């Protein structure tokens, strides 16, 4: 259920747990709770079992359809605005998508990273660092203490290590570590030594 | 989804050697209030069928309307509507059973239990039951509602199995039905002293007896009962 | 939800020619989980055998109760309790807690030491004496045992033939009950000796 | 709504509306495509125009398929949009990008359905 | 119920029990919980028997139609997503499903996709579903290797279901072994758990707490 | 369960079926449902089998002690009072529906007690699931000044109606006849209309068919 | 049910039907709902059969104990004993009682004790399920100091209509006439009152 | 609130043989603790040597059997009076049952017949439409009373050769039609004794190469 | 409430009280519960006020539409239109109706349509909460072919007792007399009927 | 919630989780869920927050009171019989003790280890290896496969490592390792390198 995101000076770092639990046991311990919406836009999601991936893959198709149609990459602001609208439409629909998402992207025209937190109701907010569910209860106190806008990607990763360690120490559930991805001017990459 | 408001009590019937007998009381109860006393719950459908209905009276009057439409729609472009193409009890029952089940599947039931009693064109007795759930069954004796618990034990002594039908005469069957109605009047709180009785015979045809009266009741033993135990005077 | 179905288990008693048979499965579980394959449910208080099914805590509690009661009975009476007398002792003890009842179905089996005739009796969880001349069943698989015992059982079976009938009734009924199995034990009770046998059966 | 059978058989077996649709194609700007051992080259002929924003002939349907055309320019946008939606729908439903054979069957199927539907040319 | 499917060098081994219970009454002992969607795809029944049997039978037709149109065998990823999408349409309507869509393809290799009624769809090397899944994991997690021989892999699947059958009240009857290879799935027979338990006990010395 | 009491010209007869059911299953095919409260006061119970057996056993004990105390034959009224007061004290939790009948120095008596402690006097009564089926026969055929034979036939016929027509009633008919001048006669299994037929095959297993792990001799 | 009590010139008449029902089934059709709590004090019982029978037994025990110690009680005292049991246990005993009695000084008296446990002295009282259908009839037709014959005719007309319209009321009409001449019990069968 | 489902009790039993199939069921019809009818046919010959019975809620059992018989008629119309295979019939019923997945036929059905190679076939259906071919299957109220006895006597479960100390199981032999009827009769006679919802008669439909044969046997009526 | 309809020699009289209550509060004490659905067909409304008013409006629209096309309807036709609305929406509309009307051929007719939606032709009909208290009185006192004066006196006695015993009934007594002479409206105030 | 116990040839090995969780966070990660009832009897417990320790300390007082009174150490069978009786008394009391216990001891007179599993209902059963709650769902399959009565303490500890590793892998909750204690002829000792 862990979904973390921190925006640093030059890039956005999204961390998400690897564990997948269905009832009594852990089915998988290497799950990737992210979808690349664009070459420079990444979406992390969490929520109900089936809604998270159905919604994420449905969003990814529309963003891909827009990119091919206009031969242009949507800005992270536009993607988040589009994603928020879909969540807002669903929250009052026959079967809502109970999905909480983090949208981290690099705006190639403003040359600035962008991190957007949208909950299943459709509450879009841009933050320097975000988290969904109870993962933000343990991490905001550290981020409020250590975060500075001008951190480099290396300092941001060091800060995520502290946030993840605190989650491991105090949060009861075992989330089997995190997969960390960095959205930079060069695209999306995964940190493997984390 | 509905509930019954004004209801008719048990209908009882049985088949004898030459036909069938069906009886029902002329009462519509509104709760514990014995409100309506002129309700006729036996519905002749042609010369060889009688449909007895129990339960909600409002749905009973709806079914009674459907049956009169069958008799009309059957006579359309049917010169043999009286001789060789008239409505049989089996055709009438299948229509009602289909309607009752279709309403059930829509969760809008006809809150009724119906007994279709008649004699087929070939002379075979017909006696089948159907209720709000669409459940149907046949027996030498059929009773709805409260009569299944009290009338059937009495009627079944006369015709306990299929082989007993040919040995049961009109008089034996009729007195059994009449006695069962008296027993129902004794122990049924929602029952009336007046009832209608229909006899469908393969020879004499339909004989519909209205305003029959429960008679020869026993109450003289009540004077000797005092208190609920210890009381002596 | 139902206390009598948490732990499973089954007990069956049969009567023969001057012999009684009482058998049970050895499974103890927590609903789906099987915990022990050695949880015996048949206890003897002299020449009278008591098979208790139902909640495993109540089975254990009643064993120590009837051991307590039958031990005091033999000290005051200076003789062992007979199956008929024990049947009423079990019945009264279960009724003494009508409103706090044990969720157990006991099965009494034995041979009266004086008259020498076989005896078996059954019970509900509040002590209705179901005295039967043919067979008694209890436990989760009572439905299976009733049909299984009702077909195989015949009057006046010899001790060797009674073992085949009761064991076959138990194994086949246990095989069709999820919460019963993991081995079974059969007691063949005769006026002069008792034989205890463990049956080979499916361990799933 | 409007469901008249615009495409019908002529007494000699010809569906004139379909043949007249071919005449529209022969009047459009010419596109040429030659495929070699390792690549396919799509060329096009252009009829105060702004080259930056005037739509190009070769339109990507997906990251790996390009669709060139000739004929009525307005109609092409309808096919291309349908092709693009299907290409993304195929990935969303089967996780595999459309094969060029698959995409041509869909686009050809759409064109065929318009020669046998009422109220459409 | 206990159904498992794990990937190894020789393909996929699918092992399932055969017990169906209506409460504590064991309705059947020989239920076929593996659904043969195609000569190349295998399903797996857990939870709703009717939902699994009907929709995985329907899924076979969709796979066949893909064959006829594309003239190529449908991938396991596409087959599991066709089922996953449909199972999601009925989410909340009352469907019950936990299944592994096991298949082996040239371009994709051995593949197991776990699809359940929530709409979940997971690719993995080992999956166990049913009441006795935790017991099957215990045996698999310790004895599973990628380099298992086909003979050793079949035994591991057979042994894993035996462990769940022994300890789980709602699992047992018999073990149905399937092996998915490059040329389709192979049925390796039905093994009675009652007979297998004693055979396994003597050869391994395991289940030492069981007398016999 | 089907239970009936029929008062006749010189006493009272109570009858009952012998089937005991645990839901849809017939636990006991020959349960004795007629219980003694005293030699000439008998009780027949429907509803919960344990409470009917237990409540009558408690009252039967008190009737005997009270009879020894007063040196008098028990009154059926004493059983009714102690029985209804006991049931009322428990506010219906003791689900014992009972027909108590007997003869005492003051004549023959027939009462029914409901689980809540209410009682009624009657010349013919019925309880159990088959009460409506049995009461149909009692209503049809009961008459004043029945002889002992007519009453026994009427009581048995009423029970049979419940046996044949009620699923919860079956097997055999138990009859107890209590007449004022003489002893109570308990006709256990008065009629046995449901004797099972011979089985099609014999299921005697050959010895050695069962597999055995170990054998032991148990000390007594 | 349908219970009734009417004071008249020479005393008081208690009356009731004979039917008791458990749902639609008539458990007993010849019940005696008139209970003697003292020699000239009788009560009619409506509501729960178990509760009313228990109360009547306890009240009879109290009035019997009263008579041995303090002389014969009055109808007011009997109603007072009923009130304590009905009121002090109003949350448990769902009992509605009509108490009628006779004594030389006060002649006939009627006390109704509705479900709440209050006591009301009335010239005539009607209770039970079937009473609701004869509130208008009894009010229009009741008169003070009617003769025994007029009161019996009045009661027969009243209950015949209560029996007619109420499913849970019927059977024979049982009357108890309390006067200086003693206690008299009357019974009217359906063939007598049904065609009034 | 309206409860659209009932329970008319009864029991059905299908057993498949080497060259025959029997589908048996008691003819009693009940409601609560009352007997509706003592002879209500429950097993029906649906044509093409297929015998079908739906047990449980009678209205749905009647409706499903009525709809299957209709399906067979259209199969003949569509496929030129082609005989409907038992497996084809079984698959067709699954679609009848699952066509009402969210308002199911509250009935457990069994169809018996002969497969294309002449061996007895028995299919049992879950109320929502799961079917699996079986050698013998009892359904209904007294399935637990009947079925364990048939495992012991038909499949020889838990029975070993005497003198081998449980090492050798009793070989499974061929039961003739006559012997199966004895087991069916004794199974239902036993269930009649201990189940209140079973009795009044036993209807057995024997499917064989010659066609469908019907037999009726009386049971206790209490 | 308390609504009533009585056929008599020259026609039919419809009558009702005037009180409508929302709990213990009397929302309106002078309500007019007699509704004209056609010139000589009137209906009394009991139960939900919204449902009965909606049904009466729709029935009036249907009978008005009927009259323009098929001539004047009979009271049976008006009750039939009521039944379709009351029956086809019996799960929603909690309405109990008494339909009385006059035509030359059939004279006065009364149809009662209880909560279930069935139709019953009666010589006289009573409905409402207060009707339960005058079932016995009306049955004993109603006669066939009474004069207008006797019927009005009979109705005044009947409703005065229904008003007397029912809290949810009271106010003025409004009557509509349907005869060949036309429609006549009468009103009786409490000072006129209360001391009958 | 993890409570494991394995009886080997010469000793009994009891393992219990170190984590204590109260709602949202882990309060403690070094808790000892055991009480020494006698020099050669040890009791592990699990269940409701307060009941486990109140019951365990109440039992320990009575066993200590018996030992001082008769100057004699109760056998593990007697202690388990005593403990079962208290659980049986409580399960049908005003406020039951919802405590599941494992009682491992060394019977110095029979010179044999003994392991008893008693649940909160009062179901005493002697096993070669025991577990309470869902901890037995993951471990019994391994113990059924590897357990042999004649294992040494070292082999038994090696078997607990496998059982604990399986719990770590598949159980969603993070129980912060286990504390392992061995009841031997020499008394009770704790294994620290586990």
Swiss-Prot record, chain B:
Keyword Cytoplasm among record annotations: yes
Localization per record: Cytoplasm; Nucleus
InterPro entries: Ntn_hydrolases_N, Proteasome_beta4, Proteasome_bsu_CS, Proteasome_sua/b, Proteasome_suB-type
Main location class: cytoplasm
GO biological processes: proteasomal ubiquitin-independent protein catabolic process; proteasome assembly; proteasome-mediated ubiquitin-dependent protein catabolic process
GO cellular component: cytosol; nucleus; proteasome complex; proteasome core complex, beta-subunit complex; proteasome storage granule
Alphabetic keyword roster: Cytoplasm, Nucleus, Proteasome
Further details from the record: Present with 16900 molecules/cell in log phase SD medium.
Family under the similarity heading: Belongs to the peptidase T1B family.
Subunit architecture: The 26S proteasome consists of a 20S proteasome core and two 19S regulatory subunits. The 20S proteasome core is composed of 28 subunits that are arranged in four stacked rings, resulting in a barrel-shaped structure. The two end rings are each formed by seven alpha subunits, and the two central rings are each formed by seven beta subunits. The catalytic chamber with the active sites is on the inside of the barrel. Interacts with CIC1.
Protein name as catalogued: Proteasome subunit beta type-7
Organism: Saccharomyces cerevisiae (strain ATCC 204508 / S288c)
UniProtKB/Swiss-Prot annotation, chain D:
Subunit annotation: The 26S proteasome consists of a 20S proteasome core and two 19S regulatory subunits. The 20S proteasome core is composed of 28 subunits that are arranged in four stacked rings, resulting in a barrel-shaped structure. The two end rings are each formed by seven alpha subunits, and the two central rings are each formed by seven beta subunits. The catalytic chamber with the active sites is on the inside of the barrel. Interacts with CIC1.
Identification of the protein by name: Proteasome subunit alpha type-4
Misc note: Present with 16800 molecules/cell in log phase SD medium.
Location within or outside the cell: Cytoplasm; Nucleus
Protein family per UniProt: Belongs to the peptidase T1A family.
Shown part of the complete sequence: 3 to 127 of 254
Positions bearing Phosphothreonine: 54
Known function: The proteasome degrades poly-ubiquitinated proteins in the cytoplasm and in the nucleus. It is essential for the regulated turnover of proteins and for the removal of misfolded proteins. The proteasome is a multicatalytic proteinase complex that is characterized by its ability to cleave peptides with Arg, Phe, Tyr, Leu, and Glu adjacent to the leaving group at neutral or slightly basic pH. It has an ATP-dependent proteolytic activity.
UniProt gene name: PRE6
Curated annotation (Swiss-Prot), chain F:
GO annotation terms (biological process): proteasomal ubiquitin-independent protein catabolic process; proteasome-mediated ubiquitin-dependent protein catabolic process
Cellular compartments annotated: Cytoplasm; Nucleus
Catalytic activity line of the entry: Cleavage of peptide bonds with very broad specificity
GO molecular function, one term: endopeptidase activity
EC number(s) on file: 3.4.25.1
Active site per UniProt: 1 (nucleophile)
Enzyme class: hydrolase
Domain of life: Eukaryota
Family from the record: Belongs to the peptidase T1B family.
Quaternary organization: The 26S proteasome consists of a 20S proteasome core and two 19S regulatory subunits. The 20S proteasome core is composed of 28 subunits that are arranged in four stacked rings, resulting in a barrel-shaped structure. The two end rings are each formed by seven alpha subunits, and the two central rings are each formed by seven beta subunits. The catalytic chamber with the active sites is on the inside of the barrel.
Role summary: The proteasome degrades poly-ubiquitinated proteins in the cytoplasm and in the nucleus. It is essential for the regulated turnover of proteins and for the removal of misfolded proteins. The proteasome is a multicatalytic proteinase complex that is characterized by its ability to cleave peptides with Arg, Phe, Tyr, Leu, and Glu adjacent to the leaving group at neutral or slightly basic pH. It has an ATP-dependent proteolytic activity.
Name of the featured protein: Proteasome subunit beta type-2
Part of the whole protein covered: 30 to 249 of 261
Swiss-Prot record, chains G, I:
Catalytic reaction annotation: Cleavage of peptide bonds with very broad specificity
One GO biological process term: proteasome-mediated ubiquitin-dependent protein catabolic process
InterPro entries in the cross-refs: Ntn_hydrolases_N, Pept_T1A_subB, Proteasome_bsu_CS, Proteasome_sua/b, Proteasome_suB-type
Catalytic residues, chain numbering: 1
Location (main, coarse): cytoplasm
EC code: 3.4.25.1
A GO term from the CC aspect: proteasome complex
Any Pfam family: Proteasome
GO function terms (MF aspect): endopeptidase activity; threonine-type endopeptidase activity
UniProt KW keywords: Acetylation, Cytoplasm, Hydrolase, Nucleus, Protease, Proteasome, Threonine protease, Zymogen
Locations listed in the record: Cytoplasm; Nucleus
Keyword Nucleus: yes
Subunit and interaction comment: The 26S proteasome consists of a 20S proteasome core and two 19S regulatory subunits. The 20S proteasome core is composed of 28 subunits that are arranged in four stacked rings, resulting in a barrel-shaped structure. The two end rings are each formed by seven alpha subunits, and the two central rings are each formed by seven beta subunits. The catalytic chamber with the active sites is on the inside of the barrel.
Matches recorded under PANTHER family: ATP-DEPENDENT PROTEASE SUBUNIT HSLV (PTHR32194:SF0), METALLOPROTEASE TLDD (PTHR32194)
Remarks, miscellaneous: The side chain of Thr-1 acts as a nucleophile, and the N-terminal amino group acts as a proton acceptor. Present with 7250 molecules/cell in log phase SD medium.
Family stated for the protein in its record: Belongs to the peptidase T1B family.
Protein's name in the database: Proteasome subunit beta type-1
UniProt source species: Saccharomyces cerevisiae (strain ATCC 204508 / S288c)
């Amino acid at each position: 259920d862990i979904i973390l995101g921190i925006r640093v000076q030059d890039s956005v770092i999204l961390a998400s747990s690897k564990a997948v639990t269905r009832g009594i046991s852990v089915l998988k311990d290497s799950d990737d709770k992210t979808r690349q919406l664009s070459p420079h836009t990444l979406m992390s999601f969490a929520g109900e079992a089936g809604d998270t991936v159905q919604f994420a893959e449905y969003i990814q198709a529309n963003i891909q359809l827009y990119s091919i149609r206009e031969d242009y990459e949507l800005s992270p602001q536009a993607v988040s605005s589009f994603v928020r609208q879909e969540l807002a439409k669903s929250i009052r629909s026959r079967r809502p998508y109970q999905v909480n998402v983090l949208i981290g992207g690099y705006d190639k025209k403003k040359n600035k990273p962008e991190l957007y937190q949208i909950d299943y109701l459709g509450t879009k907010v841009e933050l320097p660092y975000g988290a969904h569910g109870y993962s933000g209860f343990y991490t905001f106190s550290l981020l409020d203490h250590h975060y500075r806008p001008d951190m480099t990607t290396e300092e941001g990763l060091d800060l995520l290590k502290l946030c993840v360690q605190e989650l491991e120490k105090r949060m009861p559930m075992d989330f089997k570590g995190v997969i960390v991805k960095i959205v930079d001017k060069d695209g999306i990459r995964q940190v493997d030594d984390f | 989804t509905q509930q019954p408001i004004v209801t008719g009590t048990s209908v009882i019937s049985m088949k004898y050697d030459n036909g069938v007998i069906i009886a029902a009381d002329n009462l519509g109860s509104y709760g514990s209030l014995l409100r309506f006393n002129g309700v006729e719950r036996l519905i002749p459908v042609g010369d060889n069928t009688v449909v007895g209905i129990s339960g909600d009276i409002s749905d009973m009057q709806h079914i009674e309307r459907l049956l009169k439409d069958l008799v009309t729609e059957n006579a359309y472009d049917n010169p043999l509507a009286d001789a060789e193409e008239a409505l049989e009890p089996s055709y009438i029952f299948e229509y009602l059973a289909t309607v009752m089940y279709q309403r059930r599947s829509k969760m809008n039931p006809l809150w009724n239990a119906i007994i279709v009693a008649g004699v087929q064109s070939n002379g075979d007795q017909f006696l089948r039951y159907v209720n709000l759930l669409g459940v149907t069954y046949s027996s030498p004796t059929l009773a709805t509602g409260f009569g299944a618990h009290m009338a059937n034990p009495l009627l079944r002594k006369v015709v306990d199995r299929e082989s007993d039908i040919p040995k049961t005469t009109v008089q034996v069957a009729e007195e059994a039905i009449v006695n069962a109605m008296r027993v129902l009047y004794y122990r049924d709180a929602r029952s009336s002293r007046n009832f209608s009785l229909a006899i469908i015979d393969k020879n004499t045809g339909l004989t519909f007896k209205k305003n029959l009266q429960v008679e020869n009741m026993k109450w003289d033993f009540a004077k000797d009962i005092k208190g609920y135990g210890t009381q002596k005077i | 939800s139902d206390p009598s179905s948490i732990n499973g288990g089954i007990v069956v008693a049969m009567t023969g020619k001057d012999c009684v048979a009482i058998a049970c499965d050895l499974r103890l579980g927590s609903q789906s989980l099987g915990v022990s394959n050695k949880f015996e449910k048949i206890f003897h208080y002299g020449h009278v055998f008591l098979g208790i099914t139902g909640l495993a805590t109540d089975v254990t509690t009643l064993n120590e109760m009837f051991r307590y009661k039958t031990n005091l009975y033999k000290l005051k009476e200076e003789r062992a309790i007979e199956p008929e007398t024990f049947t009423q002792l079990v019945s009264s003890s279960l009724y003494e807690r009508r409103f706090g009842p044990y969720f157990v179905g006991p099965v009494v089996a034995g041979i009266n030491s004086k008259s020498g005739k076989p005896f078996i009796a059954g019970f509900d969880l509040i002590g209705c004496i179901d005295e039967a001349k043919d067979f008694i069943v209890s436990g989760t698989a009572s439905d299976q045992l009733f049909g299984m015992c009702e077909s195989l059982y015949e009057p006046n079976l010899e001790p060797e033939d009674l073992f085949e009938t009761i064991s076959q009734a138990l194994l086949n009924a246990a095989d069709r009950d999820a919460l019963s199995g993991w081995g079974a034990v059969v007691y063949i009770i005769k006026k002069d000796e008792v034989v205890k046998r463990y049956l080979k059966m499916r361990q799933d | 709504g409007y469901d008249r059978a615009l495409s019908i058989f002529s007494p000699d077996g010809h569906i004139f509306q379909v043949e007249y649709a071919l005449e529209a194609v022969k009047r459009g700007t010419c596109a040429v495509g030659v495929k070699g051992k390792n690549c396919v080259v799509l060329g096009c002929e252009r009829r105060l125009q702004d080259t930056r924003i005037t739509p190009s002939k070769v339109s990507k349907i997906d990251s790996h398929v390009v669709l060139s055309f000739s004929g009525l320019n307005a109609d092409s946008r309808i096919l291309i949009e349908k092709a693009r939606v299907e290409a993304q729908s195929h990935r969303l439903t089967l996780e595999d990008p459309v094969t060029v054979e698959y995409l041509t069957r869909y686009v050809a199927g759409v064109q065929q359905r318009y020669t046998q539907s009422g109220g459409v040319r | 119920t206990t159904t498992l499917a794990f990937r190894f060098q020789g393909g996929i081994i699918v092992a399932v029990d055969s017990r169906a219970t209506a409460g504590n009454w064991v309705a059947s002992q020989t239920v076929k919980k593996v659904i043969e969607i195609n000569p190349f795809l295998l399903g797996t029944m857990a939870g709703g028997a009717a939902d699994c049997q009907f929709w995985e039978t329907w899924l076979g037709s969709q796979c066949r139609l893909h064959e006829l149109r594309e003239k190529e065998r449908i991938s396991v990823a596409a087959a599991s997503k066709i089922l996953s999408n449909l199972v999601y349409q009925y989410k909340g309507a009352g469907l019950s499903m936990g299944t592994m869509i096991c298949g082996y393809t040239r371009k994709e290799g051995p593949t197991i996709y776990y699809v359940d009624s929530d709409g979940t769809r997971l690719k993995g090397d080992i999956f166990c579903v049913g009441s006795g899944q935790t017991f099957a994991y215990g045996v698999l997690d310790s004895n599973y290797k990628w380099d298992l021989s086909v003979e050793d892999a079949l035994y591991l699947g057979k042994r894993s279901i035996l462990a769940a059958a022994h300890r789980d009240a709602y699992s047992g009857g018999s073990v149905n072994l399937y092996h998915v290879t490059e040329d389709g799935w192979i049925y390796h027979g039905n093994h009675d758990v009652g007979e297998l338990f004693w055979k396994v006990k003597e050869e391994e010395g395991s289940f030492n707490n069981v007398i016999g | 369960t089907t239970i009936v009491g029929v008062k006749f010209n010189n006493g009272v007869v109570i009858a009952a079926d012998t089937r005991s059911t645990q839901g849809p299953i017939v636990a006991d095919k020959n349960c004795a449902k007629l219980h003694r409260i005293s030699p000439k006061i008998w009780c027949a119970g429907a509803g919960t089998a344990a409470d009917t057996e237990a409540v009558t056993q408690l009252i039967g004990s008190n009737i005997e002690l009270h009879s020894l105390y007063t040196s008098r034959e028990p009154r059926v009224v004493s059983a009714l009072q102690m029985l209804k007061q006991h049931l009322f004290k428990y506010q219906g939790h003791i689900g014992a529906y009972l027909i108590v009948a007997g003869v005492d120095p003051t004549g023959s008596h027939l009462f029914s007690i409901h689980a809540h402690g209410s009682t009624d006097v009657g010349y013919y009564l019925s309880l159990g699931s088959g009460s409506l089926a049995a009461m149909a026969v009692l209503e049809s055929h009961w008459k004043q000044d029945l002889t002992k034979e007519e009453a026994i036939k009427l009581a048995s016929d009423a029970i049979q109606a419940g046996i044949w027509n009620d699923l919860g009633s079956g097997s055999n008919v138990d009859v107890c006849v209590m007449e004022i001048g003489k002893d109570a006669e308990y006709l256990r299994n008065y009629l046995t209309p449901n004797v099972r037929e011979e089985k099609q095959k014999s299921y005697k297993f050959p010895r050695g068919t069962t597999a055995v792990l170990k054998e032991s001799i148990v000390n007594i | 049910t349908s219970i009734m009590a009417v004071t008249f010139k020479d005393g008081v008449i208690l009356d009731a039907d004979s039917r008791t029902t458990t749902g639609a089934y008539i458990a007993n059709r010849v019940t005696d709902k008139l209970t003697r709590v003292h020699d000239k004090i009788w009560c009619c019982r409506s509501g729960s059969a178990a509760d009313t029978q228990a109360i009547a037994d306890i009240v009879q025990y109290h009035l019997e104990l009263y008579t041995s110690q303090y002389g014969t009680p009055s109808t007011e005292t009997a109603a007072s004993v009923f009130k304590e049991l009905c009121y002090e246990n109003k949350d448990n005993l769902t009992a509605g009682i009509i108490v009628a009695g006779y004594d030389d000084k006060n002649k006939g008296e009627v006390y109704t004790i509705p479900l709440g446990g209050s006591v009301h002295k009335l010239p005539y009282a009607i209770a039970g399920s079937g009473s609701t259908f004869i509130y208008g009839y009894c009010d229009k037709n009741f008169r003070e100091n009617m003769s025994k014959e007029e009161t019996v005719d009045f009661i027969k007309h009243s209950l015949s209509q209560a029996i007619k319209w109420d499913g849970s009321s019927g059977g024979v009409i049982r009357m108890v006439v309390l006067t200086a001449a003693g206690v008299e019990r009357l019974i009217f069968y359906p063939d007598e009152y049904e065609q009034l | 609130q309206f409860n659209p489902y009932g329970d008319n009790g009864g029991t059905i039993l299908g057993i498949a043989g080497e060259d025959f199939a029997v589908l048996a069921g008691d003819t009693r019809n009940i409601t609560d603790y009352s007997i509706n009818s003592r002879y209500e046919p429950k097993v029906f010959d649906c044509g093409d040597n297929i015998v079908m019975s739906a047990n449980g809620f009678a209205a749905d059992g009647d409706a499903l059997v009525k709809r299957f018989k209709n399906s067979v008629k259209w199969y003949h119309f569509d496929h030129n009076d082609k005989k409907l295979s038992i497996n084809s019939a079984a698959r067709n019923i699954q679609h009848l049952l699952y066509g009402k997945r969210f308002f199911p036929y509250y009935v457990h059905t069994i169809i018996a017949g002969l497969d294309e190679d002449g061996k007895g076939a028995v299919y049992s259906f879950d109320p929502v439409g799961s079917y699996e071919r079986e050698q013998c299957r009892a359904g209904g109220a007294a399935a637990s009373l009947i079925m364990p006895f048939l495992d012991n006597q038909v499949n020889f479960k838990n029975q070993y050769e005497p003198g081998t100390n449980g090492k050798v199981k009793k070989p499974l032999k061929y039961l003739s039609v006559e012997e199966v009827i004895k087991l069916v009769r004794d199974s239902f006679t036993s269930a009649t004794e201990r189940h209140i919802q079973v009795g009044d008669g036993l209807e057995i439909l024997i499917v064989t190469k010659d066609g469908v044969r019907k037999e009726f046997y009386e049971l206790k009526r209490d």
